[PDB]
Amino acid sequence: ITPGTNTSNQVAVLYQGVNCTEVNVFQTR
Amino acid sequence: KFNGLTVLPPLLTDEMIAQYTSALLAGTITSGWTFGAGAA
Numbered sequence: 393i394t395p396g397t398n399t400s401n402q403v404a405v406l407y408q409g410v411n412c413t414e415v416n417v418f419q420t421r
Numbered sequence: 422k423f424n425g426l427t428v429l430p431p432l433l434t435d436e437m438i439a440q441y442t443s444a445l446l447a448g449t450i451t452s453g454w455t456f457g458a459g460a461a
């Protein structure tokens with residue numbers, strides 16, 4: 393998940409259908 | 422199925438789809454066609 397590289401160099405990462413015990417950190421559905 | 426196959430969730434939950442049908446219906450009952458053409 394990217395703000396666009398012109399906006400910022402940060403990213404967030406989604407592990408699709410994975411529980412956070414298996415991989416800020418947040419459990420989405 | 423559990424060998425390469427996955428199902429992704431829809432972007433809008435069924436609760437959010439029901440908030441849209443509610444808003445369309447409540448606009449239609451209170452304001453006729455006018456909420457399609459402009460402000461209700």
Ligand SMILES: *[C@@H]1O[C@H](CO)[C@@H](O)[C@H](O)[C@H]1NC(C)=O
Pocket residue numbers: 411412413419
């Ligand atoms: C993830 O793991 C926790 C602890 O084992 C569990 O309570 C939860 O139901 C699991 N699933 C999701 C989707 O969070």
